[PDB]
């Protein structure tokens, strides 16, 4: 996102507001045709492209409304404040720093980090349904799961992996108990 | 759901993994812990685009 | 499949450490464990 520290509202604010947000979803739910696309945002110059070098000389605020406006449940994770003011960009969504395999992990920020790595490893060899045309592919050693199931504890990103359409496991009912010593 | 990105060779799917390399036409400065007379080396791998 | 198409490779300072700059460009979690650790990253 592109932060405009200049604003008549007396403080920094994004170049993106409800209007485009309204317009964006309008394009999606068409399925009259207008197709207000992502590129239109770049054409409007509301979101910028940044590489590693460009990151050297910017000041990225974490969550837009968390920090951009100026200035309690303890179970909420403790965060830093927006003492700084001269921002230039705000993260679109912090959860997007993960990869493809990582994103499937529910509540990864509640895990010991190497565990995340292990899941990302195994998740590659998770028996499931790899393609919907498996009946015509003559590949070697294909594996299909009898009754797949969408996970109950999904992730916002997971919808963008088509995971809900091609799940890779089942929601088993699990009881944690030293029951029979087996 | 299949999204391409891979070539088919003699009936086998193949994928070109992205490769990593140092930047071209960029200057870099290195020290030298070795007792070699060259304390600092300002290496640069130049290249024509 | 998706992860594979977004995989990076790196032939052999220390590259295995997750570098600060890797933020939000390569996955801080997905990396094969063992001889490839750190050397193989994913966007």
């Amino acid at each position: 996102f592109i932060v405009e520290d200049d604003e008549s509202l007396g403080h920094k604010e994004l170049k993106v507001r409800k209007g485009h947000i309204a317009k964006l979803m309008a394009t999606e739910y068409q399925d009259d045709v207008e197709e207000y696309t992502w590129s239109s945002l770049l054409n409007e110059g509301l979101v910028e492209y940044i590489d590693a070098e460009e990151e050297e000389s910017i000041l990225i605020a974490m969550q837009p409304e968390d920090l951009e406006p100026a200035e309690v449940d303890p179970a909420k994770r403790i965060r830093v404040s927006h003492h700084a003011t001269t921002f230039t960009h705000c993260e679109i969504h912090p959860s997007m720093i993960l990869g493809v395999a990582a994103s499937i992990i529910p509540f990864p920020d509640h895990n010991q980090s190497p565990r995340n790595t292990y899941q990302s490893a195994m998740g590659k060899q998770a028996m499931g349904v790899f393609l919907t045309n498996y009946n015509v592919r003559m590949d070697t050693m294909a594996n299909i799961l009898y009754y797949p199931q969408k996970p109950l504890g999904t992730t916002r990103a997971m919808e963008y992996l088509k995971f809900r359409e091609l799940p890779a496991g089942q929601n088993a009912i699990v009881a944690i108990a030293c029951y029979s010593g087996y | 759901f299949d999204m391409g990105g891979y070539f088919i060779i003699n009936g086998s799917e193949k994928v070109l993994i992205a490769q990593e390399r140092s930047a071209g036409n960029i200057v870099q400065v290195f020290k030298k812990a070795a007792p070699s007379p060259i304390s600092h080396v300002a290496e640069i791998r130049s290249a024509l685009e | 499949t998706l992860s594979h198409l977004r995989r990076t490779n790196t032939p052999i300072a220390k590259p295995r450490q997750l570098h600060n700059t890797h933020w939000g460009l390569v996955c801080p979690a997905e990396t094969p464990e063992g001889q490839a650790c750190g050397l193989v990253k994913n966007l």
Binding site: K18, G19, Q63, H93 | - | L5, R6
Partner: peptide, 30 residues
């Protein structure tokens, strides 16, 4: 209203637009 600043939740629509325009394997194709 349409001039008001956005909340965090709205970003997913942007992300949904982002994937709609690009897709996951853009760079391979690009």
């Amino acid at each position: 209203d349409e001039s008001a600043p956005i909340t965090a939740e709205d970003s997913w629509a942007v992300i949904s637009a982002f994937f709609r325009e690009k897709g996951l394997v853009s760079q391979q194709l690009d």
